[PDB]
Design a protein around this ligand. Sequence first.
Ligand SMILES: N=C(NO)NCCC[C@H](N)C(=O)O
Ligand SMILES: N=C(NO)NCCC[C@H](N)C(=O)O
Ligand SMILES: N=C(NO)NCCC[C@H](N)C(=O)O
Ligand SMILES: [Mn+2]
Ligand SMILES: [Mn+2]
Ligand SMILES: [Mn+2]
Ligand SMILES: [Mn+2]
Ligand SMILES: [Mn+2]
Ligand SMILES: [Mn+2]
Lengths: 336, 336, 336
Amino acid sequence: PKLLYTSANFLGIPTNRGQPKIGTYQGPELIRKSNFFQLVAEDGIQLTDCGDIIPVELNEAEDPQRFGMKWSRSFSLTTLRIAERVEELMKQSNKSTPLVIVGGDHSMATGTILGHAEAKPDLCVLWIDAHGDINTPLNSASGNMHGMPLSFLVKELQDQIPWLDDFEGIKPCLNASNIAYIGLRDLDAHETHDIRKHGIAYFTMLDVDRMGIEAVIKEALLAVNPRLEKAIHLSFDIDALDPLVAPSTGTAVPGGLTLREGLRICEEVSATGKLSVVELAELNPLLGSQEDVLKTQSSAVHILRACLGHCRSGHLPFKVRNLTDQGIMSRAAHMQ
Amino acid sequence: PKLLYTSANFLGIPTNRGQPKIGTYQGPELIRKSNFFQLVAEDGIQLTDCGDIIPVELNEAEDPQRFGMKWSRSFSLTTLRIAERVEELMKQSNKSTPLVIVGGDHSMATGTILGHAEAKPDLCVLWIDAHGDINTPLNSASGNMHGMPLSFLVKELQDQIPWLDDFEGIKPCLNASNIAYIGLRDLDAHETHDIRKHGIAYFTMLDVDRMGIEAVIKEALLAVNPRLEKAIHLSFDIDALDPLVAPSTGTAVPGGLTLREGLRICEEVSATGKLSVVELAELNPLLGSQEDVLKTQSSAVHILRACLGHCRSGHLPFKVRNLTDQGIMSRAAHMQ
Amino acid sequence: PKLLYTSANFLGIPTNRGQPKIGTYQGPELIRKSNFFQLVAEDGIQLTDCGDIIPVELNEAEDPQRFGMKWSRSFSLTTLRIAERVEELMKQSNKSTPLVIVGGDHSMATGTILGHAEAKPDLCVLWIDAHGDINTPLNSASGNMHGMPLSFLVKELQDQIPWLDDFEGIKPCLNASNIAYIGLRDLDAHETHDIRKHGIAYFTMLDVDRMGIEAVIKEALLAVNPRLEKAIHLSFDIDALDPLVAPSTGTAVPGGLTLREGLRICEEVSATGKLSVVELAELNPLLGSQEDVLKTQSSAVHILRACLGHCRSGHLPFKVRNLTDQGIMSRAAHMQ
Ligand SMILES: N=C(NO)NCCC[C@H](N)C(=O)O
Ligand SMILES: N=C(NO)NCCC[C@H](N)C(=O)O
Ligand SMILES: N=C(NO)NCCC[C@H](N)C(=O)O
Ligand SMILES: [Mn+2]
Ligand SMILES: [Mn+2]
Ligand SMILES: [Mn+2]
Ligand SMILES: [Mn+2]
Ligand SMILES: [Mn+2]
Ligand SMILES: [Mn+2]
């Protein structure tokens, strides 16, 4: 049996200061508690747990609202700490060794992409989400950083980002043409404006309905990675999936991707051989019932396994088993 | 941003005498308690709450069984009261101003369509339901009026409707060729007979499975509104949707439309520019768990928003926001 | 109204020694307690309840592990008892009279197919399951017989089956070319090996996603029954369906068939006119909540009804009802 990726790194980022609901910090543990590692090993992949990044969580006095943003300095400091760690992991592995990141609220993506791009400047981004996460600070109704992580990364948007000194090291490292969305269904008006104005490829649930997920995936890859020349940063918000399948998340929106559609995205991205980083955001084990958490954990594990190359059509055994070798009489042998 | 419909009317009809399970009278309140109105406003639509129609609910002595029908005189009197109110609302608005009606059990449709047709005689009807709701009184196993509302409206069926004096003012205002069903999966044998005999266009879940919802919608519109010349009466039974998505309803049937399929129907109907009335029937907040009710409410709100023109691919802002106008330094400006 | 099958037999097989979770023995009762029989009758089908097969359940001392298998002698003895009963039922009915079997864990299939093939040697098998159920004894991680029932039946696999005297009467009666799988998503590596090596037709959830269920069904029938010449043994594991739709089963796997996809398989198999036996395995009413059991029961009933020829597009009445015959005045007659 052949593998596109024989080894992989696992990294937890328990961000929770990007949105007000406590519990996203438990995301990484939700996956470590699962059978994820075991299942990955059974497919013949060597998965190294690289631990957790410690987010910077300032107190209220140190981090007051600035431009309506909540916890903006905890964000800039966390973003830089994340970027350093991801960069160093990606360069140590510069076949290929994918980095699997479990969050944590989606505000971590500013840091993960920043670091990733430092090691791989020509990357593209596939953003799987019910939301755009591209609100610029003055347009955000909530001030929640998890709704803004792309806005700081996109060059074309920098005239709508307020300057802050502590954000200086957060260099916009993405062109609008390097990003493609899949799964959108709850865009804010100003996000819609920016996405259309700057030509960001986007495939909403309407598109998934009309085109089918197979054509959507194909068109998304065509738009930002036409010849599979670029490393892929796959940023997967669990809330992209339907609430029936991933209820334990802070901003659930009805009419999402089926688990199967989610699997198809990850299977195809994996199969390009260009999956460089996959991050899974917005797991919150403190939301919903016990069964809700189990469903969400289960969905997340299947998604992540798909990213690493798990095939639903089965895998071949590494060693084929033979009855005769154990000194055992078969039915065929007995009849002969 | 442009809108097909800039204003709309909202009307509650808390019918509950069309079926035995208490709670459909709470349907209108379930939607008023939601964020429906707020969400409609945020899309730039002016929605006027026109209140509730008071159904006529006679006592047992005044309204005994007649031809097996339960509460048939409460029905005829309610039907006429509804018809008057809907007619007057539709004529006051004779662009275009859609009427959104929340029930209430589906027996209200005899009245809503009667009134609608008085103002718009050439209308067509799109009936989205797991059921035919076209049982004639002697064929009904239950005697529940919510299973008969179309039978009194269809001209071709009048030789199978028993005459009752109090039904005189309920004039059959529909031809069989003006109706198309989507979502059917639990037809009674005599409904199947009448539907096929009189050539009523129907697309069951089997058809949805084999054709896909996109082709079904297209064929349904082709059958009853080929050139978008006619006003559309969209009669949406919440039980058309799968029980996983709308559990809180009295006659739930497995294997229904996904929410997305339901949204596609409403999105396409809305986009014709001919949506004249949409009614949503059979919400029952007294059925199922608290979470069941929330799921059902949520599904209903998304469906109704789609009918009014909400786009899952986003809307443009009415006023585009500019950093410089507030006297704020952007990152781009700072770097220059 | 015409019927492909006017009569049918119903048989319970409460196997529970094929897997460790208590409750599959309650499967047959779960269906008898439903409205299944009534619904089948209302479609005009004569369904005869033929009772239950009593499985042989030895004690621990009489049935120790052999080749890692758990309860292997209870299995061989049960297999032979089942085979005798099914053979005798199929020969008594040698139009056509389908046998409907409700389990019981899937280990019963070795017996049902053995008996079926005795009466109909040229049969084909459609295996609807999340799992291959084709583990050979030394490759099974669990030793659970419900994961091995096909391995004893497939001729090409007999050099990997250990000989046991009490298994002598279990004659391999299937060629690898007579079997087609639909719904696979959790194959063990050695199953994948055997399936590919011996050319067993298989359509996994990946295939369902990429091809659509319509093409999958067509290709599955083409592979093992190209000209509808052969009797069909439809072996339906309830766990083939998504856990959202059939939670009450022992080895549930996310991302399964929708109920509608399951219905389409059974509808098409039924419509060939070659449905000879359908068995439904792995119902376990002792698993999950009360609502979970109700959902699972409901899904099972709809599936079974589809197998017997129930049409979601409706059925014609046997006697058409006429208003005038009862001495009743119609609205049409009154107006004339
Ligand atoms: N992490 C996420 N979505 O994927 N947060 C949701 C953001 C929703 C909303 N637009 C906000 O600005 O807060
Ligand atoms: N409102 C509805 N369906 O949409 N009621 C269901 C009617 C079911 C059944 N045929 C009856 O006559 O009572
Ligand atoms: N009846 C069933 N599946 O349909 N059992 C599941 C078997 C799973 C696993 N391969 C085992 O050998 O035990
Ligand atoms: Mn999101
Ligand atoms: Mn997000
Ligand atoms: Mn209905
Ligand atoms: Mn209805
Ligand atoms: Mn199974
Ligand atoms: Mn099975």
